[PDB]
Amino acid sequence: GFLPHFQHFATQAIHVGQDPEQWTSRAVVPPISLSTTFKQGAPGQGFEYSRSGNPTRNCLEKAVAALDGAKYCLAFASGLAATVTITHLLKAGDQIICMDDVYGGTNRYFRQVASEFGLKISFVDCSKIKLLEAAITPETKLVWIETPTNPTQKVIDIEGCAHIVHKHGDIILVVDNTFMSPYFQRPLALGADISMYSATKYMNGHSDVVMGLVSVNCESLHNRLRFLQNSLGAVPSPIDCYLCNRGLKTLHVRMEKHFKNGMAVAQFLESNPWVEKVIYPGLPSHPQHELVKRQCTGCTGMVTFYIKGTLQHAEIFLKNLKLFTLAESLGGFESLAELPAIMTHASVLKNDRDVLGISDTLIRLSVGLEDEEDLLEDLDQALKAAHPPS
Amino acid sequence: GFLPHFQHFATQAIHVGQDPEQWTSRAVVPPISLSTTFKQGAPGQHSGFEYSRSGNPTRNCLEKAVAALDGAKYCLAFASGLAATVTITHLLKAGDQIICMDDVYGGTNRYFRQVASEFGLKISFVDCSKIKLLEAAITPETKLVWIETPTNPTQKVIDIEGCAHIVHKHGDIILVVDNTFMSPYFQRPLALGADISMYSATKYMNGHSDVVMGLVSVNCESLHNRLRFLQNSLGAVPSPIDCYLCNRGLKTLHVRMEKHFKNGMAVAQFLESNPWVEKVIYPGLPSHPQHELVKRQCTGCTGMVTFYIKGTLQHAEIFLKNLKLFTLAESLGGFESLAELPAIMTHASKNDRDVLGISDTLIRLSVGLEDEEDLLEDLDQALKAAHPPS
Amino acid sequence: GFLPHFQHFATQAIHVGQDPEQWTSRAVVPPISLSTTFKQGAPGQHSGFEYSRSGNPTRNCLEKAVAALDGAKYCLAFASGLAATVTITHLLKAGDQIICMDDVYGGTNRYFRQVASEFGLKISFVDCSKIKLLEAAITPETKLVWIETPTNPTQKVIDIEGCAHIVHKHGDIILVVDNTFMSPYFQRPLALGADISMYSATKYMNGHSDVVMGLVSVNCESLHNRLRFLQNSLGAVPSPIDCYLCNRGLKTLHVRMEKHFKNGMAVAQFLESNPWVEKVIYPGLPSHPQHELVKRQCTGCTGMVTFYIKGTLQHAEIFLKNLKLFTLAESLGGFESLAELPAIISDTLIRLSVGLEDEEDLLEDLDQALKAAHPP
Amino acid sequence: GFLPHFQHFATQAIHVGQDPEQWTSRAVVPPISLSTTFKQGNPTRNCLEKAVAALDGAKYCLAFASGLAATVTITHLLKAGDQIICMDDVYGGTNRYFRQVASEFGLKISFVDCSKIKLLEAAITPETKLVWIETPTNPTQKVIDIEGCAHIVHKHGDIILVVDNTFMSPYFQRPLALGADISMYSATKYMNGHSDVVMGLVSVNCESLHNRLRFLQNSLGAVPSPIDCYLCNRGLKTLHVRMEKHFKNGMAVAQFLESNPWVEKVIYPGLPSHPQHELVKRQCTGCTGMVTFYIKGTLQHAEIFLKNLKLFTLAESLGGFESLAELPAIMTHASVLKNDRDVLGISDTLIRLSVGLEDEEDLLEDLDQALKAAHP
Ligand SMILES: *Cc1c(COP(=O)(O)O)cnc(C)c1O
Ligand SMILES: *Cc1c(COP(=O)(O)O)cnc(C)c1O
Ligand SMILES: *Cc1c(COP(=O)(O)O)cnc(C)c1O
């Protein structure tokens, strides 16, 4: 019942930005151009300064656009740099509405930093249309959403938000598509103005690159954003560019497997007597399940659950994992487990967390590409060991 | 007559941050750790790294080395020099004023003028070369003073110690010195009263024209924490490979900067004696207006030589076109010599630039590490091809 | 009905050698250690790293992972597949004979015939496609037997286990199997009785077409020790960064190989359907003359498809020249699809290295190229 | 009084092979080209070879995965039944390869004191095909008359002279200028200078020799990683400033040690007390940071001395930016037979320094304090 997979996705992942006719070599894999300057044929003149920038950032960028079905893509030092740059599209007096449940670092940036520079920040859910409709003002100029949301995996109707945000006039809708990747979801096809990623996660997928990507269609938006790319200089390294472009080549066969494993894990957890509740859009227990099948071609490896009992039971459970690793980050090849309230989302004010449901009993799992059976044995084994009140 | 060289510079460039006891292998050169996360013994720890962005072994060594070379207690690395500036100005709030030196690098000019001002920051450009003008320009709302010495490209020299006294006399206002041209080998703005010593590492620090990078050295405790927080929240972070590479560059900073100074001196002297040259602006020359100041605040000079060819734009252009060794290009500080025409190239971002004396006639040389005789022979030939009215 | 997929492969591909308890930082992904020397506590202490040659953290993790993936005790990493072949042969001495396969990779061929022979090693070549032929060739001086399966490009399959009994009956001889074109996901020569399981990692292991790297997996204690000595003393050694990149690529070997197989199968069945294709050679087809051996010996197949087009060389060229998705290039085992005319093994033989692009597209491109060759 | 510096060295280290017109980007620093496939050697290696060629005053250069793999490729020029003559004090590894590996494949190995030209001339056999020289030698710093050797070896036909120039680098010594046939480097040392690349370099002029080498570089497959090539080429850009600071620092350290009453004897080419000092000046533009000496007393004193170094590091390599110390008889030259070392002067009491680029005052202080501690 899912949206049928995007035609040509793998072919494009492999071949776009990657044409051999580009180099004197004819090489299949693009060379890494570390250099910061370029010889000019005459003063008023190709490439001129690496930060503006360069061959390897450009290849990555043509490829990510393609996969997003976009005309343009822009690459940054990190997902937060992408965010901070995106917010620089605005001015003092502007308002930003932000999905109430959102990456820790995003919350922090909007609440404690952008609010210092004449920007009004409102937190809204935004998974409920009429609340968003209410919060919009003549001052509103950016609407930032995430779906599913990190860590609670609330799911927003993107085309729904798109239609309503664009009725009001000149308002930019950004969708942070970190969790799903353009393999499973194309915010731009659903009417978003920007589709943004922390490429640190699934896009690169190999836990060895920190990076941001922003994809766009609108001509004037692209130009304004390109300016900010050069002017803020929050730019990724050419080597980082390369590694990430290398990671994309397997995005499709990585996301499929995250899908299989994720799904199995969420099914196993939901049948387990020691688990209170499982949130995973791929399950029919998910309140937005039907929506998910309309917006997405599948699901990812992110499974969040509440363990029965207290933080002490959550801790014993984490401490007994022998294959999942207790760490921050996600979307890598390796399975990771996490206690958002005290780790990844510690920078979200305690009251904000509790309204959100980020309790001491919430675990976020990032299901990796290991054997299903082993991920399953490890979870069984750890939950047995915690044995909370049933 | 220069300040004596800083005592343990060469030793510190090679050892600080670099202790083998840090690694289980006892490696003499720090490993490149690309890893995006790290395993945690327990949820919510004090100890160890947690997330690369915040963050990491290879960046942290580099930061430790640079701090030492700046004579500072802390350093922070960033994706670019520009991002280092953006982060620094995020230190402030709406209603605050920044005062900026007048001939400043084109990019810092643009960000302050065209981006920072749209967020309730008042930007004033002041010829801080005339100390009393700075004292006059200071208002209750003044939070940051941004200074560059020598200035790129006209190379006015600012009395850091004199500015520092004035900027510190009343209120709580920060003095940044962009020390990109000098490197901490030739000038220590912190020793002279600046609150922050900032680098575009892309230039001399790295020296090999293959890393874009920024650096902020700082002593003050609460200013550091305020910076550290922004480094993490805005995420304009550098790649670990770039960190590795830049730290690798630093190992020869002393031997490179000595050669830039020898070669730089010889080129300047040669230009001053040449009938086709109108004026040579070079700190190491008796003819530079702030020459004696240069000797009180610096242990030496750099490979940045600027002069005005006699005649017209056509003459500048022809001279540039005839260079066979010097390359026509936009960066600086590398191992190879670069020639540039600020008006139409690096400083394209007109009025203010006529006032500053960035005319058609003006040429910026970045003298590199090639053989002096060859450098001289290249200039000669090229000046001869243009043969301006003498 | 292939061999069951080897248990825990994906899990070991991802975790063996990657234990974060190795690094003071507990990094989840091993640091790249470029360091050439290591501080020593006292002169000639027994312990730890001393010289990168020799070797080093990053190389060491890769060796541990590959060994696990081959189901071997040990592995040694080399600057390339040829360099591995050379180190392996430095295992011998003047007066020894090596026996090599008939249809062996051009590289190992060139080195044996043109270089190794010059130093008192008899090389003599043999069709191992038939086991009694290998019997006959064995000599009181036979010290090494070099096999490669499936062969490239005619794709003949060699009964590995069969050759192992024949060869091991005569003392003291090493069986090397070049597993470059299967990868340990699909074939484990050591579990089959080979003494050595050799790779050119340049191909499928790394699969990203941006590393040259050889790999030797071994079980036997003395043979490992001998090999390690040649690793350090001849110095045909991998850069730590290549080590890293190949380890990075390993992390997706399982999902990459399933897709190569899936796509290769689809291409093979498409060609076997097409009236303009004389003949398809692909081990996953019931039409392949060693198909049964394949299912007893492998867990599946690869993206390598060979075919003969109807007509002549002209028709082969028109096809190759009209490919829009498949690239004309001389390599294989990467994520991209490559086509090649291996003679320029008759006028008419075409080799495909089928990649990870969309099935529909690969099929449409072939179909369109065959039509250009043979109109309407 | 040394040979005058080579004109254009710096200019050429920075620009040769570095021409921006080679790339569509017009990049000032050459890309790192990682590919192993090409749409119908690699650019990053090629740039490095050209630069080293220029620095050596050579027509050609070949890059290898280590200096050890360069030595092996070279020996592969010969056939069984031929003879190698090697300098009697070589790098432990060169000694090991010749004595323990090469000798197993029909080659005859002979060691000779070539610092005594009379002895080399007597040693030459109708089937000598290669003479292998290191100067100054590692670690006893014995110096050979390259030119005098060259004339002696070329007097009767088809013998190759290799000069291992690792210690000097082409900034201080150009063996090819002096009549050598091959100028060989472990680039792992001074050439890269940054302690993070393992590599070998071979420079040659002779046309037939190069084609032979080029053949072997391809067939043996001990090629370096393109990334490593990038990194070494990057190191080269500071060769002249590095080698000049090594010279000052080395010199100051030799002087200090020679004046220190706890030091029995110092061996350093830049000192008048070196028996070949005068030769060093006719043959070289300067000296390096390699300073070897004998501490007064027994093994205990050497050991206590090493334990108290606080700036120099106890490690097993050389020629990098960091100051290094080792005790050859126990570390770096354990692979040379005990009886070999005694004859060679590698005793319990010989310490080899690699002086780096730290401030001179600190290095002298660290040695002062270490010697005081060993001898109160
Ligand atoms: C981690 C994350 C980010 C920020 O990306 P970085 O590269 O870590 O700065 C943004 N959005 C989401 C949903 C994330 O999970
Ligand atoms: C180039 C430069 C900067 C910032 O440049 P980046 O290219 O973003 O590293 C800052 N100050 C000076 C003097 C510069 O030349
Ligand atoms: C170390 C060394 C070698 C061997 O080179 P590697 O890069 O260690 O394989 C050869 N010659 C000399 C003089 C050396 O010091």
Helix and strand topology:
4 copies of one chain form a homotetramer.
Chain A: H1 9-15, H2 55-68, E1 72-76, H3 79-87, E2 95-99, H4 104-112, E3 120-124, H5 129-135, E4 140-146, H6 158-165, E5 172-176, H7 181-184, E6 194-198, E7 212-216, H8 219-232, H9 238-248, H10 251-270, E8 275-279, H11 289-295, E9 302-307, H12 311-320, E10 325-326, E11 336-338, H13 350-356, E12 362-366, H14 372-386
Parallel strand pairs in A: 2-3, 2-4, 4-5, 5-6, 10-11
Antiparallel strand pairs in A: 1-7, 6-7, 8-9, 9-12, 11-12
Helix pairs in contact in A: 1-2, 2-9, 10-14, 12-14
One pyridoxal-5'-phosphate (PLP) binds at residues 80-82, 105, 107-108, 148, 152, 178, 180-181, 200, 202-203, 212, 214 of chain B.
Major pleated sheet of chain A: 7 strands, mixed
Number of strands of chain A: 12
Structural class of chain A: alpha/beta
Helix fraction of chain A, binned, reads 25-40%
Query: Bound compounds, please?
Result: pyridoxal-5'-phosphate
Quaternary status: homotetramer
Task: Give the CA-CA distance, first to last residue of chain A.
Answer: 34 Å
Strand content of chain A: 5-15%
- What general form of chain A does the structure show? globular
CATH class category label of the largest domain in chain A: Alpha Beta
User: Helix tally of chain A?
Assistant: 14
Secondary-structure element pattern of chain A, one letter each: HHEHEHEHEHEHEEHHHEHEHEEHEH
| CATH-level-4 superfamily name of the largest domain in chain A | Type I PLP-dependent aspartate aminotransferase-like (Major domain)
Gyration radius of chain A, to the nearest Å?
Answer: 21 Å
Number of self-contained structural domains of chain A: 2
The order of strands across the largest sheet of chain A is 1-7-6-5-4-2-3
Q: What CATH architecture of the largest domain in chain A would you give? A: 3-Layer(aba) Sandwich
Pathway (chain D): Amino-acid biosynthesis; L-cysteine biosynthesis; L-cysteine from L-homocysteine and L-serine: step 2/2
Subcellular location (chain D): Cytoplasm
EC number (chain D): 4.4.1.1, 4.4.1.2
Cofactor (chain D): pyridoxal 5'-phosphate
